[PDB]
């Protein structure tokens, strides 16, 4: 009945003086905008339909046209920035916010969805949705004794929209909006649905992606232990954002990093550092590098949890981007570690795989590795064992690489190479 109309028929119906004709034409628009292959968004916009849809959102008297127009506008708003802008320019934001209070669950849900697409465009529209007062009525929809009594699709859409209100930087969301949302987020983070859990974790990852003051707001809410629990989940879509959030937190202060250690995160790293998904290995190693950039007592926890052999493992064999994060983890470890911690590193076999990485055609990892060698030498000096170390590097082909690097395009590379050579070889 409302299948495969032309835009001109849609326009004719919507321009009729007849609410039922308008409803049928709006549903036909919804079906057009709902098809997988190239929905004619720009055609619908060019026909001048957005203002009509927006006015239909206000017809409390005709809940079906509210729904159909909400869905049509949702799909227009899901398009390019310019398409989302056309929806916002039509006055849709306050109209959708009014629909959050609808007695019809399917209509409020659609308003939630539409607002998520709008906010999802970027920080300006995100902040404009917030200024129009979206947060209170959204949070009210989740103010129930037990989340499990809500429809699953409904709760998933709400969680997703809230996560978009937490998303993007330049600038990050308003501090007071974040404080307003966080308690609900913490509660969703304890829900049992994997998709709600995944999107909640993503939201927490966005909020921890910034300066220490932002990390602190989250850490203060006591969520780190739950994040560490989620870090051990079987579902990759949960582990990925849980690990991103943990990684973000350890870019903060040593005290913030310690909360992650206290929560038990390190015991999960044997698995993460050998995870068959390369993204996970890379991000786990990145996280380790910011832990080895901390205090000597924190480095010692890395040692105690048996994680140095896992770092040697990743340095020995991994996707190259992971190997680069491992090199960083090693340079950090050697920069900040005691002599005894640094010795331990050598005994775990760090030298050969470090040397093997010197043949990389990546200038930055070479600098990083050379720096590690210097720090390791520095430690052997304090023990008067620099000759034993020189032989080791000599015996595994390390010297051939360092000597050959003396004649290298980069300046500080050739500098460090020649320095190492003359100072120790």
């Amino acid at each position: 009945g409302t299948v495969n109309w032309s835009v001109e028929d849609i326009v004719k119906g919507i321009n009729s003086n007849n609410l039922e004709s308008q409803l049928q034409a709006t549903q036909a628009a919804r079906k057009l905008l709902s098809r997988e292959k190239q929905p004619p968004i720009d055609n619908i916009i060019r026909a001048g339909l957005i203002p009509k849809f927006v006015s239909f959102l206000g017809k409390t008297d005709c809940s079906p046209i509210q729904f159909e127009s909400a869905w049509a506008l949702t799909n227009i708003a899901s398009g390019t920035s310019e398409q989302t802008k056309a929806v916002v320019d039509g006055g849709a934001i306050p109209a959708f916010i009014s629909l959050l209070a609808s007695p019809h669950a399917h209509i409020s849900e659609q308003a939630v969805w539409a607002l998520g697409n709008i906010a999802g465009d970027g920080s300006a529209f995100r902040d404009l949705v917030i200024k129009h007062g979206a947060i209170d009525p959204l949070l009210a929809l989740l103010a129930v004794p037990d989340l499990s009594t809500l429809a699953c699709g409904y709760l998933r859409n709400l969680t997703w929209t809230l996560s978009n209100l937490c998303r993007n930087k330049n600038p990050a969301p308003p501090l007071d909006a974040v404080e307003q949302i966080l308690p609900t987020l913490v509660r969703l983070l304890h829900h049992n649905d994997p998709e709600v859990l995944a999107d909640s974790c993503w939201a927490i990852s966005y909020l921890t992606d910034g300066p220490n003051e932002r990390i602190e707001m989250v850490v203060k809410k006591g969520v780190v232990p739950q994040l560490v629990k989620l870090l051990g989940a079987t579902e990759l879509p949960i582990v990925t954002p849980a690990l991103r959030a943990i990684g973000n937190i350890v870019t903060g202060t040593d005290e913030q990093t310690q909360k992650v250690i206290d929560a038990g995160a390190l015991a999960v790293f044997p698995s993460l550092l050998t995870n068959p998904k390369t993204n996970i290995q890379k991000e786990a190693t990145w996280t380790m590098s910011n832990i080895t950039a901390g205090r000597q007592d924190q480095i010692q926890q890395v040692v105690n949890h048996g994680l140095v052999p896992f770092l040697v493992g990743v340095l020995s064999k991994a996707d190259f981007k992971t190997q680069k994060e491992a090199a960083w983890a090693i340079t950090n470890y050697t920069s900040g570690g005691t002599v005894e911690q640094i010795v331990y590193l050598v005994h775990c076999g760090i030298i050969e795989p470090l040397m093997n990485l010197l043949s990389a055609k990546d200038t930055k990892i070479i600098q990083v590795i050379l720096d590690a060698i210097s720090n390791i030498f520095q430690a052997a000096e304090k023990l008067g064992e620099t000759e034993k170390l020189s032989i080791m590097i000599e015996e595994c082909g390390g010297l051939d690489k360092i000597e050959a690097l003396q004649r290298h395009e980069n300046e500080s590379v050739y500098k460090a190479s020649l320095n190492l050579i003359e100072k120790y070889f």
């Binding site: 709902s34 098809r35 997988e36 799909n75 708003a77 998520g116 697409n117 999802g120 996560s163 998303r167």
Partner: peptide, 10 residues
């Protein structure tokens, strides 16, 4: 990472 934007499809 989640989609920034999602249409509701048939």
């Amino acid at each position: 990472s989640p989609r920034k934007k999602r249409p509701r499809q048939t």
